[PDB]
Amino acid sequence: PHMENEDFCAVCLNGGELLCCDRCPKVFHLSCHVPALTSFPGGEWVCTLCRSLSPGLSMYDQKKCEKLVLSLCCNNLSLPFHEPVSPLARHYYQIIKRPMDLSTIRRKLQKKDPAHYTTPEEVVSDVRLMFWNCAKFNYPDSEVAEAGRSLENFFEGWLKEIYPEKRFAQ
């Protein structure tokens, strides 16, 4: 039963077949963890949030950017930005000409992707595009715009914690 661990995936909040972190209470679908897992591991397993720290990112930046992106994903305010807006939604894609969501950001952390990030700067730029699109499309007083603004405050906090030696323009 593993009641020392949560009952819903930290990322998508659904039940099902869940892998338990051995250092925190979070649980994950294999495919919801960052980086995704293809099978259940043997022995002890520690999620990316609990871990301590040449194409693609360097292995240093890879671990930091994975922690940054998973931190966003596990925050429940991020749920409206996990997936692309429904192509049936009214006017969205007439207003937002460069859409961005967390599933795209997660895909581009993989060096096999043809648009893969090569620097943390490119990761931060795509996260900020997500916040920019949220503020442009949604009216400022709406629940989604407020979640966006609050999640951005969380994200700026994590940037200073994970990348104290870096400051990212605008």
């Binding site: 099902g16 869940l18 051995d22």
Partner: peptide
């Protein structure tokens, strides 16, 4: 590793 099996939402 430890695995938990709960019901999905529906």
């Amino acid at each position: 590793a430890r695995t938990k099996q709960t019901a999905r939402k529906s």
